Write a protein that binds this ligand. Structure first.
Ligand SMILES: [Ca+2]
Ligand SMILES: [Ca+2]
Lengths: 122, 122, 122, 122
């Protein structure tokens, strides 16, 4: 579930995940392959890899909890997974904020033809 | 989400769901009735069925996590809904790829006219 | 024919019908109900209505002749149906270009199940 | 109406107009612009032009009669327009036959992007 991630994105970018992030470049929105086009796409690529290292959580992908503490998206405490999953989303949302400087609306629904490059390993 | 299913279809079949699958036969396009004309159309029939058992979910817009990096479509862990939907899509995309052999361009845009009869039960 | 309509739409708005219009608001999709969320969605409302007045015509698949060569969409003379359909499509494409000013990405993938309420009559 | 044309196309190329010639290149399927991509597309471009010169006839674009005489699609006698429209269709159908040597299925549903060159004048 990305309900929490989407909320983190909204908070960091002032933009709604859908469709600004849900379908951007080669990796935002999953089904990622090839090379991330820009900084924003790289955030999704990193977010993907992050989720990828949480192999231990493929048996219970817990919905986590977080709060705004001191104006910072702050992961709550719970199962290691809640925390790691939340950490992935958190790092991603913030990354997306930093990437707002190069975000290009023209990269939404980015054609998948430019994403058939050899994929970056992670 | 429809767009992810479309990406899966592109990955699996190399064809854009639109226009090669979004209107194909009796069940590929929105709605659908009658009897699947061929394997491809049956793929779509099953997919209709697969979505049919998930009324509790937003089978069309729920964004689920899935991966293609591996070289094959993998549905990521998440809510029951996000997985079941992704499963439906993964299965139908794989199915379309396995039906590429008998894909007929003639069936592309097919009238709901020659798609009438005791609509095959799911 | 649907694909000709989408060509008019591209010509008029510079956006591909899919995905920018094929699922916009509560009427641009392959269904439609409730109230038009905005100008753009209203164009599709009027279009459904326009098509609705052609029950005896194959509004979705009939191929009509038209020209974009003049710099503007012109429906060629043909059967009454081809003209009525083309006219519907022409008005809708133009209506969408006139509505670009208020096109909101957030309406792109609008969930049908939500915008229920009294479906506005044609 | 292209009913007669489509029959002429079927007879000349053995293929159904839809979708083989209904959405090919830049000019087959109407709404054409830019430059014909190959011989097949050039046929449609010429067919389009041919209809364009059919200035007098938009007030009464009537269905013409044609027959097979000695294995040749032969326009019947009738109003000047019946004969001109028919002659346009006849030439185009034959042209498509001859263009079969270069026909490329890949050009079906040819992308719009490739058709934004300055349109070839008639
Ligand atoms: Ca369907
Ligand atoms: Ca509709």
């Amino acid at each position: 579930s990305l309900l929490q991630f989407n909320k983190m994105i909204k908070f960091e970018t002032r933009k709604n995940a859908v469709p600004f992030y849900a379908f951007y470049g080669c990796y935002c929105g999953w089904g990622g392959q090839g090379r991330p086009k820009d900084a924003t796409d790289r955030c999704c690529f990193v977010h993907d890899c992050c989720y990828g290292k949480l192999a231990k959580c493929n048996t219970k992908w817990d919905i986590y909890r977080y709060s705004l503490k001191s104006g910072y998206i702050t992961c709550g405490k719970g199962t290691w997974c809640k925390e790691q999953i939340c950490e992935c989303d958190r790092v991603a949302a913030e990354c997306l904020r930093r990437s707002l400087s190069t975000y290009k609306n023209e990269y939404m629904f980015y054609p998948d033809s430019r994403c058939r490059e050899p994929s970056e390993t992670c």
